[PDB]
Amino acid sequence: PQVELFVKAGSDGAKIGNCPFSQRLFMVLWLKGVTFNVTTVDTKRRTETVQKLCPGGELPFLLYGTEVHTDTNKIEEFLEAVLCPPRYPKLAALNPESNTAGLDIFAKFSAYIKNSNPALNDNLEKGLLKALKVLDNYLTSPLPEGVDETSAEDEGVSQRKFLDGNELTLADCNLLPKLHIVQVVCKKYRGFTIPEAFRGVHRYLSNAYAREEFASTCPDDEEIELAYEQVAKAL
């Protein structure tokens, strides 16, 4: 069946807008290997076709054949269920812990970036750093080794590329768009970076930036920053 993902447009009404849900679903479709369209929607000037498909204005939404699906979590679950083996790869993580690691970071970032009081900034910075460290601990703790790596048993070096192993999973599709926003926005508006001491987080992001499924689905830095001009507050 025809597959079409509709996502909120950015500042010019044409490019993909900042939205971690849009990027998540783009990543899931890309990783499945299915043929699909991505189309943007300017909410201030929606096309007639879009107004008829999604009268309620929900975004992102997915057209699968002639049927419209809304709610990012429900869309993802649906895609995982219908684009399944043997024709398409299963993308669900094998370890439930992969689906909870780092889940709290984005809301801690939001609280941090939306604050304007200088002293309170420092409490919020600590909350964000603690959440990033808990993710770092997950990324540096071992999981069963994939069949394409033998270093753990051969040399004593346990390593993996992503949250759950050496392949991108649904968990990474949720988390990576959010971490990317955290990075770009915190650098711009706070001069804050994820500490180099968090090796797990840095190795993960390096490995992810080397995959087009992630790198190519990121909005450009200026667009992300622009989307935060009425969200981020100056101290």
CB 152 within 8 A of CB 158: yes
* Exposure class string for 1-23: b at 16+ Cβ within 10 A, else e: eebbbbbbbbeeeeebbbbbbbb
Q: Are 4 and 36 in contact (CB under 8 A)?
A: yes
Exposed / middle / buried, residue 104 (Cβ in 10 Å: 0-12, 13-18, 19+): middle
Class of domain 93-235: mainly alpha
> What are the helix (H) ranges across 33-147?
48-53, 72-82, 105-114, 118-140
Helix (H) or strand (E) holding 143: none
CA distance 170 to 24: 8
Domain boundaries, the chain: 1-92, 93-235
Provide the token pair at 33. Answer: 């290997």
Binding site members: 19, 59, 72
* Counts of helices then strands in the chain (DSSP H, E): 10, 4
Radius of gyration of the chain (CA): 19
Token pair of 24, please?
A: 């998540």
Residue where the block lists tokens 């929607």: 41
Technique behind the model: X-ray
H or E element at residue 20: helix 20-32
What is the three-class DSSP state of 162? coil
**Measured distance CA(111)–CA(43) in Å, rounded:** 26
Measured between alpha carbons, how far is 177 from 174 in angstroms, rounded to an integer? 6
Annotated binding-site residues for glutathione read 19, 59, 72
Query: Which residue type sits at 52?
Result: K
The residues pairing with 37 across neighbouring beta strands, listed in sequence order, are 4
Resolution, angstroms, 1 dp: 1.4
Distance separating alpha carbons of residues 3 and 192, to the nearest angstrom: 39
Environment class of residue 39 by beta-carbon count within 10 Å: exposed (0-12), middle (13-18) or buried (19+)?
A: middle
Whether 71 contacts 47, CB under 8 Å: no
Whether the Cβ atoms of residue 105 and residue 179 lie closer than 8 Å to each other: yes
User: Is 158 within 8 Å of 142 (Cβ atoms)?
Assistant: yes
Task: Reply yes or no on domain 1-92 having CATH 3.40.50.2300.
Answer: no
How many whole angstroms separate alpha carbon 221 and alpha carbon 21?
Answer: 17
Bridge partners, 45 (sequence order): none
Cite the DSSP H helix spans in 141-198.
Answer: 151-155, 170-190
Distance CA 16, CA 42 (A): 10
| Cis ω before 86 (30° cut-off from 0) | yes
